[PDB]
Structures are given as structure tokens and as C-alpha cells.
Ligand binder design. Structure first.
Ligand SMILES: Cc1ccc(NC2CNC2)cc1C(=O)N[C@H](C)c1cccc(-c2ccc(CN3CCCC3)s2)c1
Ligand SMILES: [Zn+2]
Length: 316
């Protein structure tokens, strides 16, 4: 038979493109290893004339790509590149409407927790350590959210169609954000035991589970103690751009102006539906691509986010 070839671009960051020549006789997988075009596996697909000049994602098999990859993704896990493409292949087919001047996702493949988290990430000051996340986030804010949503799944070890905890997802995204400066000082007072001051840095400094009221946390909350008597934990000092207050879903009333945004969760554990309530001039319930407006909001709320700079307690 006759030998035909085409010119294609190979890359791992879609930033450093390496020109390559492909034998139309052979498949992409035989000569490049796992290969993906727009997140679609082409490892067992022979090249087409239309493919010439197009960009193709490949697995790092030489040291140039090993580096370029780690520098972009900040991970050296081999499976990560495949999972990002696997995901992206689906997330490029979602619809991302501007809802209340924020990018959102039309409900599909249980994307409700992702929509919420994304609507959330557009309202708080997050500086992303991996370029991949930065580049995608910016392109998300503009409305092309496919790549972002796809990196979130990849970094959270989740697959399209599977429902996720909004809090477990933010925990993960904060692992990959610059929150080193953030500081939290907690005093815990037990009448028998005495006092104990705790300082938390990074992700632990902006996430609390067991109370949704930033107000109640400052006042102090009841927690069990070693001696069996109850103890009071209150916020001494918060140095962060925001704080995340989480609790198991329960009836809560968000008043306009007291919070930045909230995750409402209706349904049983691991099978419920998520809505995003954002506080602006009035209250805005962003539920996938749908939108309702109230002055107040009574619903089961598991996550509430508040903006912050530096807070010092006046107690004692
Ligand atoms: C959606 C989801 C996905 C995955 C996971 N996986 C584990 C976390 N890492 C692995 C968790 C959840 C979850 O469901 N979270 C909600 C907020 C949540 C988290 C914790 C507990 C609950 C509830 C227990 C009983 C409920 C019914 N309630 C709702 C209102 C009144 C009765 S909801 C709900
Ligand atoms: Zn005690």
C-alpha cells in the first residue's frame, strides 16, 4: 500500500504545541500512546484529512512533556490527564447560561454540585496555584466553563454523572489555591478543663463544620468535652478573604445582606439536589439554569459563605 501522512500538533497544556507527522495507515494510539482530540479518545482511531493542523492531547512519555505537564497541572499522577479528557468530552456538551450575571450550568449528569461550586467560586477571592485551574477559571467567568468543570472532576477524582458534596469539592479546590496567609484563632472554654486557644493555617482556617451562622461561631457554639461537660468554642481571630460555614442540611432562613452565598440541599444523603442562593440587591436562587427571586429564603442549607478581611474578638 501507499504511505500517506498529515501534520498535527501534540501537547499536554494546549500552550506548548509540538508539530508531529502521523501515518494515516496507523492509529493515534500505536504511534503516540493514549491520544485525545477535544477530550474525545482517538487512541484506536486512524487519522483523517480534517485532523491535519488540529491540536491533540498526549500522555507524557518523554521528559519535556513530564515537566510541561507538572508545571501546568501541579500533579504527576499518570491517570489525571486521561480523566481530564474523559470528563471534558462530556462537559463540552453542557450549556453554560449567564444567570443573574454569573456563569452557571444547565442541569445534566448530576452537575448540580458543580454549578453551585462554580457560581460560588465567581463570588470569592481564590488564587489558583496550578495554571490549568487559573486559565480555565478566567475562561469560565466569560462563559466557556467546560474546561474548568472538567478540571474540577479530574482534581476531585469524580466522573461525569456522579453527584458530589459541594463542601468536599471546595475542600479539594482550596488544596490547590493560595490560602497560606489565612489564619484562624479559636478559644475553647470548659468550666472544669479551662481554656485552650487553637491557630489554624491554610484550608483549615476558612472551613468549619457544625454551624452555618458566622454570627453564632463568633458568639461561641456548644461542643462536647473530654470530662463530659459541654464546652464553648468561639472565633478569636479570622485572617482570610472569606470563611466557609458548613453543617448537615437543616431548615435555615437567609436574610438579604448577612451572607455572600449559600448551598441549599434538598433530599437524602448522596442523592439530593443542590441550589445556589446568592445575596445581591435582593436574594437570587440560581438552580441550574432556572432563577427565582425572594427578599428572604427558608430552605435546607448545608453551606454558607461570608466575605472577610481581619476579625478580632472583643470577648474578655
Ligand atoms: C451529595 C453528596 C455526595 C457525596 C457525598 N460523599 C461523601 C462525602 N465524601 C464522600 C455526600 C453527599 C451529601 O449528601 N451532602 C449533603 C450536603 C449532606 C451531607 C451530610 C448529611 C446529609 C443528610 C443526611 C440526612 C438528610 C435528610 N435531611 C435533609 C433535611 C432534613 C433531613 S441530609 C446531607
Ligand atoms: Zn472539660
Amino acid at each position: 500500500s501507499e504511505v500517506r501522512t498529515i501534520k498535527v500538533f501534540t501537547t499536554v497544556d494546549n500552550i506548548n504545541l509540538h508539530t508531529q507527522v502521523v501515518d494515516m495507515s496507523m492509529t493515534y494510539g500505536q504511534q503516540f500512546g493514549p491520544t485525545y482530540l477535544d477530550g474525545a479518545d482517538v487512541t484506536k482511531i486512524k487519522p483523517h484529512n480534517s485532523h491535519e493542523g488540529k491540536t491533540f492531547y498526549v500522555l507524557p512519555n518523554d521528559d519535556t512533556l513530564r515537566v510541561e505537564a507538572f508545571e501546568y497541572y501541579h500533579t504527576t499522577d499518570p491517570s489525571f490527564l486521561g480523566r481530564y479528557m474523559s470528563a471534558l468530552n462530556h462537559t463540552k456538551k453542557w450549556k453554560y447560561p449567564q444567570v443573574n450575571g454569573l456563569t452557571s450550568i444547565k442541569w445534566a449528569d448530576n452537575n448540580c454540585y458543580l454549578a453551585t461550586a462554580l457560581l460560588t467560586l465567581q463570588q470569592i477571592e481564590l488564587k489558583f496555584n496550578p495554571p490549568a485551574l487559573q486559565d480555565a477559571y478566567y475562561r469560565a467567568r466569560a462563559g466557556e466553563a467546560a474546561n474548568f468543570c472538567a478540571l474540577i472532576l479530574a482534581y476531585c477524582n469524580k466522573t461525569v454523572g456522579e453527584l458530589g458534596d459541594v463542601r468536599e469539592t471546595m475542600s479539594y479546590l482550596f488544596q490547590h489555591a493560595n490560602l497560606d496567609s489565612c489564619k484562624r484563632v479559636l478559644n475553647v472554654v470548659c468550666k472544669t478543663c479551662g481554656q485552650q486557644q487553637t491557630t489554624l493555617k491554610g484550608v483549615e482556617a476558612v472551613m468549619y463544620m457544625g454551624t452555618l451562622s458566622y454570627e453564632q461561631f463568633k458568639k461561641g457554639v456548644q461542643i462536647p468535652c473530654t470530662c463530659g461537660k459541654q464546652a464553648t468554642k468561639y472565633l478569636v481571630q479570622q485572617e482570610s478573604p472569606f470563611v466557609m460555614m458548613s453543617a448537615p442540611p437543616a431548615q435555615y432562613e437567609l436574610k438579604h445582606g448577612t451572607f455572600t452565598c449559600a448551598s441549599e440541599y434538598t433530599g437524602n444523603y448522596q442523592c439530593g439536589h443542590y441550589k445556589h442562593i446568592t445575596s445581591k440587591e435582593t436574594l437570587y436562587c440560581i438552580d441550574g439554569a432556572l432563577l427565582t427571586k425572594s427578599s428572604e429564603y427558608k430552605g435546607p442549607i448545608t453551606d454558607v459563605f461570608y466575605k472577610e478581611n481581619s476579625y478580632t474578638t472583643t470577648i474578655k
